[PDB]
Amino acid sequence: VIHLLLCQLRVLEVGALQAVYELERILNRFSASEIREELEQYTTEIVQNNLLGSQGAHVKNVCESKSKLIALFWKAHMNAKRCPHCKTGRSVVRKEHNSKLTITF
Amino acid sequence: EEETYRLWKIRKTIMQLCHDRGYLVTQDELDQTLEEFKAQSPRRTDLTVLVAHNDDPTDQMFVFFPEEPKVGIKTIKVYCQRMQEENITRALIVVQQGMTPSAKQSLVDMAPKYILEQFLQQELLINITEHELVPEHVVMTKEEVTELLARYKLRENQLPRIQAGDPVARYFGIKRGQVVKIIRPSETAGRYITYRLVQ
């Protein structure tokens, strides 16, 4: 998810809007370096062949896509989870009313 | 014998869907009545059709009518094998209750090697394209979209959008990134023409 979203943002910054679903499907059809090299080749090819479009990216249909992507990220992938590398890395931050964040043992 | 009425309606709708995509279909198939459908053909494996394309005679399509009311990954593989061996690329799977949810992402997983697509049976009982309010859609060719963008000084984004799951984008089998011309019959101007990028 991290690398997919990174590449989708890299392509959105220049306006390429088909690259979004193309990257997602390239991913689904496919280690961590392995995923990065699979996606970064296509993303760099897009950002290079489709530059000159940083001025033509501030249009509706390019802002809706970025909005939706970042909103879905913040909404679905930032929940407390058991940690990948060490299975016991949930030092549960759990914030009370504003001005209060409490980590546990 | 209502199963036969449903089979006949679905077969007529699929013949119309295949003709609207530009496949070689005869007038009799498009004007076939029930009495002669049941005369010819009972089963759900001899309703499978294989159609050819106007151009690219190798480019043909294959319509399936699975028996399982809820098709699964194994059912999909069993005739993805048929397609891979008969040397076809496209398919069309008419399902009676739905596809188990893992199957939908499998059909998507099969790369342009073997591109499939599903249709519910209740979605084919009538041709939505023949509704009063539904305009005529026309998949533009790669050389007409360029002239459009050049005439209006547009970009491909910055054009109205049509969803890739739109009931009339799924029917005309339009992939993503394709522009479709739409001829709205307007009470004001007669035959207004619009364009929508499929995404």
Place this chain on the structure above:
Amino acid sequence: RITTPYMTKYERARVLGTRALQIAMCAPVMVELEGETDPLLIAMKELKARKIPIIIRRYLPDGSYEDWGVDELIIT
């Protein structure tokens, strides 16, 4: 070269306004005014005679522009 040949009403309004703001700032009047103290009446007198050396720069929605002459524009 592809836009309409006529002068839209918004263009007439802005051209009259600009010519009037110029006349009022002591600009030479090429129309032989005949005792009128309004710069807008003088600007209309000039527009009717086809003496306004201004270039309407019509902008298209992608940045591309087309430069028309106020003389080469059909005033309705």
Place this chain on the structure above:
RNA sequence: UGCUGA
């Protein structure tokens, strides 16, 4: 906050 005018 209590009033008032379209």
Place this chain on the structure above:
DNA sequence: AGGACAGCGTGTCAGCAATA
């Protein structure tokens, strides 16, 4: 994943007294 729910929202138009 079926929910339960807590969470933001706006609201035509100008005057006067009077008082925070």
Place this chain on the structure above:
DNA sequence: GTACTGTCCTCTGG
């Protein structure tokens, strides 16, 4: 006022 988004909230799937 109601209806929307949102917000998880954590319950059966590999």
